[PDB]
Coordinates of C-alpha atoms and ligand atoms in Angstrom, one line a residue:
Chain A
X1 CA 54.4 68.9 149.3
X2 CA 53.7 65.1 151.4
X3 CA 54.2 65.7 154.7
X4 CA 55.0 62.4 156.9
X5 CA 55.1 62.9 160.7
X6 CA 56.2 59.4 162.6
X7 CA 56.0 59.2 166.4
X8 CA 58.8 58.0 168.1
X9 CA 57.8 56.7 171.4
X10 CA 59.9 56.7 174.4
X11 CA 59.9 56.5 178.3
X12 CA 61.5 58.0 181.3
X13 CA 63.7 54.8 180.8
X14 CA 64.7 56.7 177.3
X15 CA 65.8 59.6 179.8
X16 CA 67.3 57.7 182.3
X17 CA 68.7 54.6 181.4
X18 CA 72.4 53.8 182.3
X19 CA 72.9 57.2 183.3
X20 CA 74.6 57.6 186.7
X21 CA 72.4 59.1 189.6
X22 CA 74.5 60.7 192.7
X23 CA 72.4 61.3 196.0
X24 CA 73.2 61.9 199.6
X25 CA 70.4 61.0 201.9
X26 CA 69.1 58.1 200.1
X27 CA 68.5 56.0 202.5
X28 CA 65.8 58.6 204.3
X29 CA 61.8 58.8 203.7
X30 CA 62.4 61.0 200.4
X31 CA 65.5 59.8 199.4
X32 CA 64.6 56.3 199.2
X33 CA 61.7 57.0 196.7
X34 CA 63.8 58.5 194.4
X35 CA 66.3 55.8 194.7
X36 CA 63.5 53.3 194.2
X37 CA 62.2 55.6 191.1
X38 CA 65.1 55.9 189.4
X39 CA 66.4 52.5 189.3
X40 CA 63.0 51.6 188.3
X41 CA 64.0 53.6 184.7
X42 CA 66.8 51.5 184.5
X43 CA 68.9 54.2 185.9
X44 CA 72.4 53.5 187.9
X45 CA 71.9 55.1 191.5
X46 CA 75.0 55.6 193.8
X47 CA 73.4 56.9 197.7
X48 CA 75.2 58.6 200.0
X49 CA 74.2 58.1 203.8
X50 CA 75.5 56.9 206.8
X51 CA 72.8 54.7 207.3
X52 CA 72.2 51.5 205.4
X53 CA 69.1 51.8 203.0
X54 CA 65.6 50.8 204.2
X55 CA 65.3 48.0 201.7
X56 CA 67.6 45.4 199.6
X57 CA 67.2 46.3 196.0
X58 CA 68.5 43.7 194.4
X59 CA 70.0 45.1 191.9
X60 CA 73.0 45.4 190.0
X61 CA 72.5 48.6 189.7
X62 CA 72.5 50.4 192.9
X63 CA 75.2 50.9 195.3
X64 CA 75.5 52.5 198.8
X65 CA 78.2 54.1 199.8
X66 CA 77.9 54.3 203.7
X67 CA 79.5 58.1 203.9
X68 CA 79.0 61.5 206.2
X69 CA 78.9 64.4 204.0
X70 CA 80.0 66.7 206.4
X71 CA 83.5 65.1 206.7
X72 CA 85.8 66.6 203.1
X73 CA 88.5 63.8 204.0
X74 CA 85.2 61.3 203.4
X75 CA 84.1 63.0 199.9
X76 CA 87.5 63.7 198.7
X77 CA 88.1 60.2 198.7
X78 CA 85.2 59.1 197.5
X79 CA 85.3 61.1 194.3
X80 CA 89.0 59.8 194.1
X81 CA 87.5 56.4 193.8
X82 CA 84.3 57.6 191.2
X83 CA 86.4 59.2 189.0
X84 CA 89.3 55.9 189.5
X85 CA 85.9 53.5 188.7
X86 CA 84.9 56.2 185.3
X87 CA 81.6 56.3 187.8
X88 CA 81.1 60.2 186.7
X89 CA 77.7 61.2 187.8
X90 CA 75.1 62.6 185.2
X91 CA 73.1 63.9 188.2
X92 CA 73.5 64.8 192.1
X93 CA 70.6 65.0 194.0
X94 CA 71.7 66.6 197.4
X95 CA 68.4 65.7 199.4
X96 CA 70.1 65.1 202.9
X97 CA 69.1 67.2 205.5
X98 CA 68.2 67.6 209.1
X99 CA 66.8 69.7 211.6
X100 CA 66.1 70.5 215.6
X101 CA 63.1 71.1 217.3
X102 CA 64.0 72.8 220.9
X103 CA 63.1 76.4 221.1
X104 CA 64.8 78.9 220.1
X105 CA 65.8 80.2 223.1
X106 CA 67.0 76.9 224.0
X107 CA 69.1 75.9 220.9
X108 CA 72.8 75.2 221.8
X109 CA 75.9 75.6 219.2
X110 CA 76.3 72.1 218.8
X111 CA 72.2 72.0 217.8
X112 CA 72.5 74.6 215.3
X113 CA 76.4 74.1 213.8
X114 CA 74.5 70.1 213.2
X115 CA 72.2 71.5 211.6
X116 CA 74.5 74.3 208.9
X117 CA 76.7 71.2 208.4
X118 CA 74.7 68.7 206.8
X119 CA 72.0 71.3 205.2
X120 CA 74.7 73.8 204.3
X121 CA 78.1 72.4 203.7
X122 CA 77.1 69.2 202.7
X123 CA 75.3 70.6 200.0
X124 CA 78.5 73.1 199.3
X125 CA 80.8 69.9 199.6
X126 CA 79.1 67.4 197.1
X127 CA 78.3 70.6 195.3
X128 CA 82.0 71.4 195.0
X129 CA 83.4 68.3 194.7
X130 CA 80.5 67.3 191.8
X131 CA 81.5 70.9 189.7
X132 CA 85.4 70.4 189.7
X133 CA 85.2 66.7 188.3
X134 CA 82.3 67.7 185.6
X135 CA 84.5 71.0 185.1
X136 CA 87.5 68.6 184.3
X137 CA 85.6 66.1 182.0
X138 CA 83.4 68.6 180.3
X139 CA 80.4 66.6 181.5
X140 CA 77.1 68.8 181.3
X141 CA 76.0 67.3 184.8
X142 CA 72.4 68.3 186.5
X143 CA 72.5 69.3 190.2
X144 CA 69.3 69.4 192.0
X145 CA 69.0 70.7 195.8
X146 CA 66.5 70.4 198.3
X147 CA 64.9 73.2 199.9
X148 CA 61.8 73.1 202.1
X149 CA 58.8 75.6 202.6
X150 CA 60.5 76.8 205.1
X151 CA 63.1 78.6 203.3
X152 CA 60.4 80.2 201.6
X153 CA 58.0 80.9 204.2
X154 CA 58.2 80.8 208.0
X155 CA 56.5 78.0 210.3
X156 CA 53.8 78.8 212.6
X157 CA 54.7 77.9 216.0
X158 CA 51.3 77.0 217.2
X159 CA 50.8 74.8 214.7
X160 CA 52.9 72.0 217.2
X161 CA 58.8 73.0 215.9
X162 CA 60.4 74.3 213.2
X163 CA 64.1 76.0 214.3
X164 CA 65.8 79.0 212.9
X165 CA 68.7 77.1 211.6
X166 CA 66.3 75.2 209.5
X167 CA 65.0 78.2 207.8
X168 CA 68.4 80.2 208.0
X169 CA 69.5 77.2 205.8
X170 CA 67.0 76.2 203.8
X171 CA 67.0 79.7 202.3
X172 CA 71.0 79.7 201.8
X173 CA 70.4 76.2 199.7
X174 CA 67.7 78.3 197.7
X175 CA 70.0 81.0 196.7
X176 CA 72.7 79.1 196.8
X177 CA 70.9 77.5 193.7
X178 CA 70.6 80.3 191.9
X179 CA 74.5 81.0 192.5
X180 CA 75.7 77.9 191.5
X181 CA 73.4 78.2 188.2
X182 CA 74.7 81.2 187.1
X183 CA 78.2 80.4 188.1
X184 CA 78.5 76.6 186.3
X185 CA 76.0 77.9 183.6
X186 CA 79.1 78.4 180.8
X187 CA 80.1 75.2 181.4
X188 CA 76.3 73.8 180.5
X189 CA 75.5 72.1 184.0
X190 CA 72.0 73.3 185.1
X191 CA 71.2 73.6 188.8
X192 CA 67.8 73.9 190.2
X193 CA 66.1 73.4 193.4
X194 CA 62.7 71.6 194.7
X195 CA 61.3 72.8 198.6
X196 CA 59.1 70.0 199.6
X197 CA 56.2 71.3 201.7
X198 CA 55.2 69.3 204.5
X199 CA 55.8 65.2 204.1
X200 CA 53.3 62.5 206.2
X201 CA 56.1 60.7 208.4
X202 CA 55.5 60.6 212.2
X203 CA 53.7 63.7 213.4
X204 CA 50.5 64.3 215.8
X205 CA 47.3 64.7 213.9
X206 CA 46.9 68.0 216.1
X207 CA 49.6 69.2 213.7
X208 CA 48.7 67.2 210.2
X209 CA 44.9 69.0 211.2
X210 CA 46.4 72.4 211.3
X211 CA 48.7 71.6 208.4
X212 CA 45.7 70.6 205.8
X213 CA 44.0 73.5 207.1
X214 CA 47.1 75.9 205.5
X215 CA 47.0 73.4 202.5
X216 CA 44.8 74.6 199.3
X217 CA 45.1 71.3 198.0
X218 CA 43.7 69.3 201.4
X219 CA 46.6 67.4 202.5
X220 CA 50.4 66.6 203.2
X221 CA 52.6 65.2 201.1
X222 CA 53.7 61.7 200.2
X223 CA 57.4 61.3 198.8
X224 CA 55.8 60.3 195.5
X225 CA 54.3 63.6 195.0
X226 CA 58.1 64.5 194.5
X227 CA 59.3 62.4 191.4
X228 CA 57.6 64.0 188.8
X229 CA 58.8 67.1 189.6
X230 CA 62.5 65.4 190.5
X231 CA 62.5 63.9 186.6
X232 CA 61.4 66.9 185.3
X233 CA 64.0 68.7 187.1
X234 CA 66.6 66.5 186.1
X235 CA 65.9 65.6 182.6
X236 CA 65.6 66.9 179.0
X237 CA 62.2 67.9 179.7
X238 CA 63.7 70.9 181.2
X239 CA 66.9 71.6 179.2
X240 CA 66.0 75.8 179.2
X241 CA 65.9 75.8 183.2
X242 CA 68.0 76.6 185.7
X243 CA 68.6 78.3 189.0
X244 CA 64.8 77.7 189.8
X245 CA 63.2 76.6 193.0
X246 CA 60.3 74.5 192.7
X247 CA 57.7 74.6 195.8
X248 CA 55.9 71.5 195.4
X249 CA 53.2 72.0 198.5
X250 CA 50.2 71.7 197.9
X251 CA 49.5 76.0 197.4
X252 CA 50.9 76.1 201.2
X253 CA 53.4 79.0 200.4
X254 CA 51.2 80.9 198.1
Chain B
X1 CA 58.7 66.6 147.6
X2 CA 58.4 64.5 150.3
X3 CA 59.2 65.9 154.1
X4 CA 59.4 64.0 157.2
X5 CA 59.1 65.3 160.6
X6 CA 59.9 63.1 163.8
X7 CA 58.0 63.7 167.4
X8 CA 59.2 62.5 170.0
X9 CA 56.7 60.8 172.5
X10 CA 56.5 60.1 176.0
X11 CA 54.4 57.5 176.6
X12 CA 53.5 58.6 180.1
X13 CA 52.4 61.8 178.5
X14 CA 50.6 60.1 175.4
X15 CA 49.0 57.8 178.0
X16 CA 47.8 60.8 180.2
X17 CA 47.0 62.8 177.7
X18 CA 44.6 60.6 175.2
X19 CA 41.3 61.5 176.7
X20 CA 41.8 64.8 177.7
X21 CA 40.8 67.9 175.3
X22 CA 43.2 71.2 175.6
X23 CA 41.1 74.7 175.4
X24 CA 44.5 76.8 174.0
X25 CA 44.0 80.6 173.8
X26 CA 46.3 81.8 171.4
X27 CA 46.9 78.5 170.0
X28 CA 48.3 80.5 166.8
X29 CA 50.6 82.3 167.7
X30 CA 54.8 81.0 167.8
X31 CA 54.3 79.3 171.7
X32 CA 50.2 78.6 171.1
X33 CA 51.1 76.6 167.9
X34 CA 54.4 74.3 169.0
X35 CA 52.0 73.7 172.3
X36 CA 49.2 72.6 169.7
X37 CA 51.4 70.4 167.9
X38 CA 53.1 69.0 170.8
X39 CA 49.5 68.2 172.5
X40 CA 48.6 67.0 168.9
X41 CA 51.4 64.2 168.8
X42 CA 50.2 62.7 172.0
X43 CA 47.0 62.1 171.1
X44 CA 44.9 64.4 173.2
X45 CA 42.1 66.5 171.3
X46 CA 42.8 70.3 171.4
X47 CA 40.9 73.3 170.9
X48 CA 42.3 76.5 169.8
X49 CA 40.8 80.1 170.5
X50 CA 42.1 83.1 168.6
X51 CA 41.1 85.4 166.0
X52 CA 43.8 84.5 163.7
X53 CA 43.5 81.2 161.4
X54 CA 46.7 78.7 162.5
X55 CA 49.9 78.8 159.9
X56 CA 49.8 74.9 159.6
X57 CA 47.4 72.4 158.5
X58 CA 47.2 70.0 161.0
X59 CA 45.2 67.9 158.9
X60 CA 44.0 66.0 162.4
X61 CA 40.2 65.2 163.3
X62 CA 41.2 65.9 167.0
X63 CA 41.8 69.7 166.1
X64 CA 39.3 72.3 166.2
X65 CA 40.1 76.0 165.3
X66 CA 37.7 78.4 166.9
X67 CA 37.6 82.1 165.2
X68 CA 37.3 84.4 168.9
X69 CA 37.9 87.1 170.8
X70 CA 38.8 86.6 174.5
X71 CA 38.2 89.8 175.2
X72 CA 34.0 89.6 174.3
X73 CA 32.4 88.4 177.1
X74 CA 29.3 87.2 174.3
X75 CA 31.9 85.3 171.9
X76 CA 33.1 83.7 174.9
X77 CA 29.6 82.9 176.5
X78 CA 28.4 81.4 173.4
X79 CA 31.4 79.4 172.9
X80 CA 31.1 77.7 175.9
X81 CA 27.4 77.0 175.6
X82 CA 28.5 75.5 172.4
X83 CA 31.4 73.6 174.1
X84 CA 28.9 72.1 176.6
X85 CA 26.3 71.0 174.3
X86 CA 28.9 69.0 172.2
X87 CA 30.0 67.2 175.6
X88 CA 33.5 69.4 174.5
X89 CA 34.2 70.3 178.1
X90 CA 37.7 70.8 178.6
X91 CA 40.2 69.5 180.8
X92 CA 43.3 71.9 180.4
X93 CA 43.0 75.4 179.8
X94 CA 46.1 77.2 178.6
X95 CA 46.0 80.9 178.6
X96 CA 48.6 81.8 176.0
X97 CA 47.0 84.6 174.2
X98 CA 49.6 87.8 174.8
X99 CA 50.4 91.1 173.2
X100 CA 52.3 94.0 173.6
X101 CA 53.2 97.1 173.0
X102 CA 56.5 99.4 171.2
X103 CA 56.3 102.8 171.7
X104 CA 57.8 104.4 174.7
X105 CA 56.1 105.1 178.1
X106 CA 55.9 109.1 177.8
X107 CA 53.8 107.6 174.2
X108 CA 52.1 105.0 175.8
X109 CA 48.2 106.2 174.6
X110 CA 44.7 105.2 176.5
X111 CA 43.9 102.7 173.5
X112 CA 47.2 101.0 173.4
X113 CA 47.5 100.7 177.4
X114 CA 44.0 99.5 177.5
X115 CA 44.2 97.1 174.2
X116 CA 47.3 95.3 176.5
X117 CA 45.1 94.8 179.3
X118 CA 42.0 93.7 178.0
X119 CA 43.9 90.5 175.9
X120 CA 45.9 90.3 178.8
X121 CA 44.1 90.6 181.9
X122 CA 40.7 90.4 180.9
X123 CA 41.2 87.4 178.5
X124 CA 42.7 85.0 181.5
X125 CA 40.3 86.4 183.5
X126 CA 37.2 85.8 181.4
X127 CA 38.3 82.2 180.1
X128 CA 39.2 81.2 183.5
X129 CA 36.2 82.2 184.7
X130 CA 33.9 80.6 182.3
X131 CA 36.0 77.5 182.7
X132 CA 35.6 77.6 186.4
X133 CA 32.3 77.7 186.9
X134 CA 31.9 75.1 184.2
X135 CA 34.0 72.6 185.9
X136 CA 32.8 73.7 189.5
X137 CA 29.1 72.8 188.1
X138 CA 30.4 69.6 186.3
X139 CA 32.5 68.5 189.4
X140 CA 35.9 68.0 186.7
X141 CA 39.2 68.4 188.5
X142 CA 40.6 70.6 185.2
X143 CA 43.6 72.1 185.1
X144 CA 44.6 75.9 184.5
X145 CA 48.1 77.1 182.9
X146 CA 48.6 80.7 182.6
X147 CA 51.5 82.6 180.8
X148 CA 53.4 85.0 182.6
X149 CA 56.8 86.0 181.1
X150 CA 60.5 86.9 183.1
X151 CA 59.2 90.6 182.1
X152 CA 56.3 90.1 185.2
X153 CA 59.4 89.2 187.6
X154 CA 62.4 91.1 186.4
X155 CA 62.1 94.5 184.4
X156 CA 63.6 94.8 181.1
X157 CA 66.4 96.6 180.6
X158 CA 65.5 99.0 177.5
X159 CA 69.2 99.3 176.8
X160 CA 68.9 96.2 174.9
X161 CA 66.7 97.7 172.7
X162 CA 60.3 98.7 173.9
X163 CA 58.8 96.6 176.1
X164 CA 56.0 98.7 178.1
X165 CA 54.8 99.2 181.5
X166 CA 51.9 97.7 180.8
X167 CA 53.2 94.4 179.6
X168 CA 55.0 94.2 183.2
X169 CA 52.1 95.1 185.3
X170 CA 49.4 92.9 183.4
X171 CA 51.9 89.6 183.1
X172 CA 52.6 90.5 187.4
X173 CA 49.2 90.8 187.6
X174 CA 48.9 87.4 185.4
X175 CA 51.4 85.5 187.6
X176 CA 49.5 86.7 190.9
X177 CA 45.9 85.9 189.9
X178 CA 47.4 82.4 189.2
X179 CA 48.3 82.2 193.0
X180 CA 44.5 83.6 193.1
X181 CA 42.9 81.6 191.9
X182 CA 44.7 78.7 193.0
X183 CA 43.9 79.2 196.5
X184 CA 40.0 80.1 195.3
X185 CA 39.6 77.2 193.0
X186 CA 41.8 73.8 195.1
X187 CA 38.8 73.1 197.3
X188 CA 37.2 71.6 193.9
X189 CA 40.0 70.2 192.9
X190 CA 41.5 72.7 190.3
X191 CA 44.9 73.1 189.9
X192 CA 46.2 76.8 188.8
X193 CA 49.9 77.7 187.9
X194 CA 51.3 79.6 185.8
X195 CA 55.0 79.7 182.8
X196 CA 56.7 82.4 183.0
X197 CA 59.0 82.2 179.4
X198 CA 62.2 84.1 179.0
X199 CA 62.4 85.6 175.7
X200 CA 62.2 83.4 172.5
X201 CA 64.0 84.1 169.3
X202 CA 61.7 84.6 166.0
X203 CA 62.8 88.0 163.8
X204 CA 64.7 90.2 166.7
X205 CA 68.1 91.8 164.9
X206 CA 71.5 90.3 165.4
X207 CA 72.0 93.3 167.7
X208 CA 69.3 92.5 170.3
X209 CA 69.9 88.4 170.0
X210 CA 73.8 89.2 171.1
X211 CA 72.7 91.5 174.0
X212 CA 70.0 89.0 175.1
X213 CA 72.2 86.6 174.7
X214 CA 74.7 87.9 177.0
X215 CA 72.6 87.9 180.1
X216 CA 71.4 84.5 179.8
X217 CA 73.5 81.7 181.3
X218 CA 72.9 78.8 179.3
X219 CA 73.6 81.5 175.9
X220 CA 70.5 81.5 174.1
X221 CA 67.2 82.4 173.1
X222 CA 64.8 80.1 173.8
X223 CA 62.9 78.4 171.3
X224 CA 59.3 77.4 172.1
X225 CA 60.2 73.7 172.6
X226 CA 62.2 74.8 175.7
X227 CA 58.6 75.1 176.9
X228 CA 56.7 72.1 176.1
X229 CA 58.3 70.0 179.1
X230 CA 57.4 72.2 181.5
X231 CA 53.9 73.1 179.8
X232 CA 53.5 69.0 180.1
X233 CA 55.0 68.7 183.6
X234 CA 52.0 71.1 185.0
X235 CA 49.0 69.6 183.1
X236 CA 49.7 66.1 184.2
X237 CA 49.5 64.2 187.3
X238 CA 53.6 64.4 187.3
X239 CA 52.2 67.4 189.4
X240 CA 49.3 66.8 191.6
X241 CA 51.0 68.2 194.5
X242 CA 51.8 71.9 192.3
X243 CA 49.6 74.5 192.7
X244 CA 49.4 78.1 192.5
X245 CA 53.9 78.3 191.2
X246 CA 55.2 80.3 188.6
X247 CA 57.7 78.4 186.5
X248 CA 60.5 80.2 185.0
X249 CA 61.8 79.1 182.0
X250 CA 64.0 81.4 180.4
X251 CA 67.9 79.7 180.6
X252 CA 68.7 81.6 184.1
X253 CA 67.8 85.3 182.7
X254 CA 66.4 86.6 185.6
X255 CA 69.4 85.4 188.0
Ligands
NAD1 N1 60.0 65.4 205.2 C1 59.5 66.6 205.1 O1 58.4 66.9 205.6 C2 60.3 67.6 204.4 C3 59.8 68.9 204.0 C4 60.5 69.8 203.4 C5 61.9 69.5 203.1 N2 62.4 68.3 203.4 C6 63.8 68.1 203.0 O2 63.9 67.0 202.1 C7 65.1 66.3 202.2 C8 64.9 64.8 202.6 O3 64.1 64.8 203.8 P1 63.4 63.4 204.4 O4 62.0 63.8 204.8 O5 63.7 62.3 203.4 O6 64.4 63.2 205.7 P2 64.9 61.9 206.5 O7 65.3 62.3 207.9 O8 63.9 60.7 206.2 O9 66.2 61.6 205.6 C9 67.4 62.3 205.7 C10 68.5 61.4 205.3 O10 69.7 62.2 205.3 C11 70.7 61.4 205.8 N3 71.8 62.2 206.5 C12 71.8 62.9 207.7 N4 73.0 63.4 207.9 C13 73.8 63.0 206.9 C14 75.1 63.2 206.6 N5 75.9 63.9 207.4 N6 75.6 62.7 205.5 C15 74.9 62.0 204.6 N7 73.6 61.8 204.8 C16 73.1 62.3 206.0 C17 70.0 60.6 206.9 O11 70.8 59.4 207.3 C18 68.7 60.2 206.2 O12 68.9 59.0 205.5 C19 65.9 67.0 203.4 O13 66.8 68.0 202.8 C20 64.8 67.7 204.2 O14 65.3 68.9 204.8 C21 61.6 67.4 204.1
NAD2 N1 57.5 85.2 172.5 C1 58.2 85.6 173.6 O1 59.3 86.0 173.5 C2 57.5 85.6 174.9 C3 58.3 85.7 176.1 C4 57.6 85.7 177.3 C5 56.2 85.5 177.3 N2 55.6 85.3 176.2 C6 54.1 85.1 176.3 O2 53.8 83.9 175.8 C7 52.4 83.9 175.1 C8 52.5 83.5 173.6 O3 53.4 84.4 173.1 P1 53.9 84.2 171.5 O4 55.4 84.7 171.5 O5 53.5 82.8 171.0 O6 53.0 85.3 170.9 P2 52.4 85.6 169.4 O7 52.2 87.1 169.1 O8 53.1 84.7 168.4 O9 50.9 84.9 169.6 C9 49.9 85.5 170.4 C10 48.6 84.8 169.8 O10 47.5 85.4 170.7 C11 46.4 85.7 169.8 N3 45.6 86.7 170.3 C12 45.8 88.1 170.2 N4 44.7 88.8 170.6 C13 43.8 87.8 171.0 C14 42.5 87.9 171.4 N5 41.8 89.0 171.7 N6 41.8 86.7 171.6 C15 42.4 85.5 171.4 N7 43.6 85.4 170.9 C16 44.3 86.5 170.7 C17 47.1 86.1 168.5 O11 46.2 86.1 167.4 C18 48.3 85.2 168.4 O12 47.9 84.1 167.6 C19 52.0 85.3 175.3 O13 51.2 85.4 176.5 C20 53.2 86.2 175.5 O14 53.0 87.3 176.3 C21 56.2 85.4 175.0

């Protein structure tokens, strides 16, 4: 008995190259890494946002689609013209979100109905939309949602604020994961989750001071501290796993 | 004859990985070995720890096979003194050692609960300790994995059938020192987490596979390359930012 073993190297680009990457929000603090990381694979990147990215690409590659996810008659058509184009996505990131920050006692209908439609039936939309086109073309597409540490744990007010809403639907995106998981599982599309915690963007350092001090690890997040876990998420590194939410904190939540 | 086996690569893993040595617990058994391999093809060095000799000849002067107990604290101790001496300090630890137990609970006896618990419990315990104060004295920013299993998050369902009470409470009690230590050990820069594996087909009957089978959503067993991904994703600096998670990996079984 010879045994030969030959190592075949390969690269993300090996993952991701050519294939087609769906995401709403791409044009926000997260988003925009991701876009940036992915068509640095040599990956094709469609965003969804109603604001124009933060950068020119330049590249062939990348195309934004300036679209409000809450709004079916905007979707519908846009998946009329992806599947028109053969544009099918391999993946769909749903990363856009938003949130409030008045009091509790304060927040109005319009505050919090703002805040379920982008988090919760955006994510049900492009969700819904993504699953009936992959259903019809037997593609074995990857959904991955974005969560927060706040569906998972609750914010400490006097650490300013974190609403209700925001952890009201946060945790619906979570176990709307694992529903969606076990529901599109026979057709082989996986569907996990990642809740960011906390993300250095424009808060006081009285907060970021009593943020690190809940933080095993010392410090907030940068967007970059998401992609590995995003590729991982989305690739054949992680074939076996679905309906999973991955808190990617920094130990905050444990 | 002649065989040829192909690995697969990832260069951002063979370039992470080159200069770092894996202590693997276990490193003979069905997971411990594909991990060894898999650490093996991208050129880190790896060090395995388990009584039993490994089923393969690497045939690799960046493999070491280390004939222990994890449960004797003086085997350990001495290992590590060794370890040191030989500047073999590691950077990954990898808790896989695991057993178990048949025989139902109204059977369970003091030496078969107790035999669970010692590989299990005391075994993580003891390595991880011996590996933290090394590092904490060394000032390395190693790297702990753990193995839980879906059984220390859901509870089996013996209708499928054997698998004991104490399996559940020592791989709960694996997947909660892991948040633990990870909280005790992140202000010197050691990460903790912890892979919880659904259940991974080797010589179960055709009976058991189909029930298993049925409550998973992606329809299978897992095989233990469904785990080297993740097992990768948490000992690189693809997760700087992860600390102190359990990561299930088991095809959706405990949805
Ligand atoms: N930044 C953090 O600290 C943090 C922490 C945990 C979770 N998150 C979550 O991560 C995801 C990204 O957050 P971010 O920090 O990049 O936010 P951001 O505010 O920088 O970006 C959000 C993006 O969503 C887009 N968006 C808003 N409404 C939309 C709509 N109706 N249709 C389409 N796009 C819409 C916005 O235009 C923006 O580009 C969100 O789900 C957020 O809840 C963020
Ligand atoms: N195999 C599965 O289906 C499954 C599912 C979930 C979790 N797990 C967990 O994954 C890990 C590996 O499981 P596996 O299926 O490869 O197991 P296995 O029985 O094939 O291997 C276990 C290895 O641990 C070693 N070991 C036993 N006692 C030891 C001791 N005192 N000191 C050092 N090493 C010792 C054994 O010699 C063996 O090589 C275990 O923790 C197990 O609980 C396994």
């Amino acid at each position: 008995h010879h045994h030969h073993h030959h190592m075949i190297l390969k690269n993300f680009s090996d993952e991701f190259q050519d294939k087609l990457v769906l995401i709403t929000g791409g044009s926000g603090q997260i988003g925009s890494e991701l876009v940036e990381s992915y068509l640095s694979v040599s990956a094709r990147v469609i965003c969804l946002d109603p604001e124009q990215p933060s950068v020119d690409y330049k590249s062939n590659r990348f195309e934004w689609i300036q679209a409000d996810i809450t709004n079916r008659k905007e979707i519908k058509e846009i998946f009329l013209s992806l599947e028109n184009q053969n544009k099918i996505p391999d993946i769909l990131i749903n990363c856009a979100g938003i949130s409030v920050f008045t009091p509790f006692e304060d927040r109005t209908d319009e505050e919090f109905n703002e805040v379920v439609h982008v988090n919760l039936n955006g994510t049900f939309l492009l969700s819904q939309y993504t699953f009936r086109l992959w259903k019809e073309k037997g593609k074995k597409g990857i959904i991955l949602n974005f969560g927060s540490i706040y569906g998972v744990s609750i914010a400490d007010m006097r650490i300013y604020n974190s609403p209700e809403v925001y952890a009201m639907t946060k945790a619906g995106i979570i176990h709307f994961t694992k529903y969606l998981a076990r529901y599109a599982a026979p057709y082989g599309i996986r569907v996990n989750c990642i809740s960011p915690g906390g993300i250095f963007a424009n808060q006081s350092s009285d907060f970021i001071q009593n943020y690190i001090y809940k933080t095993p690890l010392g410090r907030m997040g940068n967007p970059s501290d998401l992609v590995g876990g995003v590729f991982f998420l989305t690739s054949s590194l992680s074939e076996y796993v679905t309906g999973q939410n991955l808190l990617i904190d920094g130990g905050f939540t444990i």
